[model samples]
Target: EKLKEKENNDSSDKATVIPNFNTTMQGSLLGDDSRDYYSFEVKEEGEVNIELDKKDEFGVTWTLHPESDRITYGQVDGNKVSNKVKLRPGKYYLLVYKYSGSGNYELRVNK
Candidate 1:
């Protein structure tokens, strides 16, 4: 829907860059129809685990990929979703989204 599109635009307007491992981004989804996008890098071939922990509300999904438009990995669930994957040395993105609701969340990356 157009609502999601607007949300994406708003989020992309203020995208966060996660420089390396063990970084946590504090963010929120504006209602049940918003998202947040973050960029990160993989310096060496290793395992990366991305998790979304809700601070105020629930219902969010996390997607990881080298490209913003594609999802290489995703976690779809209620309050939290964590994914561990073997990654190559490159740049990637994490997209946290939901259909309806406003909430606070913590985006954590571990290596």
Candidate 2:
């Protein structure tokens, strides 16, 4: 029920504030239309790793922006999808979604 409520309220285009950096944020997706946006602040020029973990058949896709260069699409090694990108000191947004189905996922940022 809470996942449905969150799915109804959140979208990929709009950003949600991430409480902190280098931490794990958990969420769920109920359908293809359900997306979660997370925003984080970068203090210095460095590379950060974004990892997604899920336990379902549905493939999860993630993207980093306003840098459109990186998009991880369901390419998981085991049960996780990971990507590393270079970033400057500023704010960044991480978007997650699925093509269909429902599942829960954990997203983490590492530097």
How do all models score by TM-score?
0.76, 0.76
- Model 1 TM: 0.76
Candidate 1: minimum summed lDDT over ten consecutive residues — where? Answer: 1-10
After superposition on all C-alphas, the RMSD of every candidate to the true structure, in Å, is: 6.4, 4.1
Quantify all predictions' global Cα lDDT against the true fold. 0.69, 0.69
lDDT of 2 by residue, 29-69 (tens): 86555678877788899887888888676777777775335
Candidate 1 C-alpha lDDT tens digits along 10-96? 354455777657767777776544767877888899888887777776567767778435466567565677788888888887777
Estimate the overall C-alpha local distance difference test score of candidate 1: 0.69
Candidate 2 residue pairs in backbone clash: none
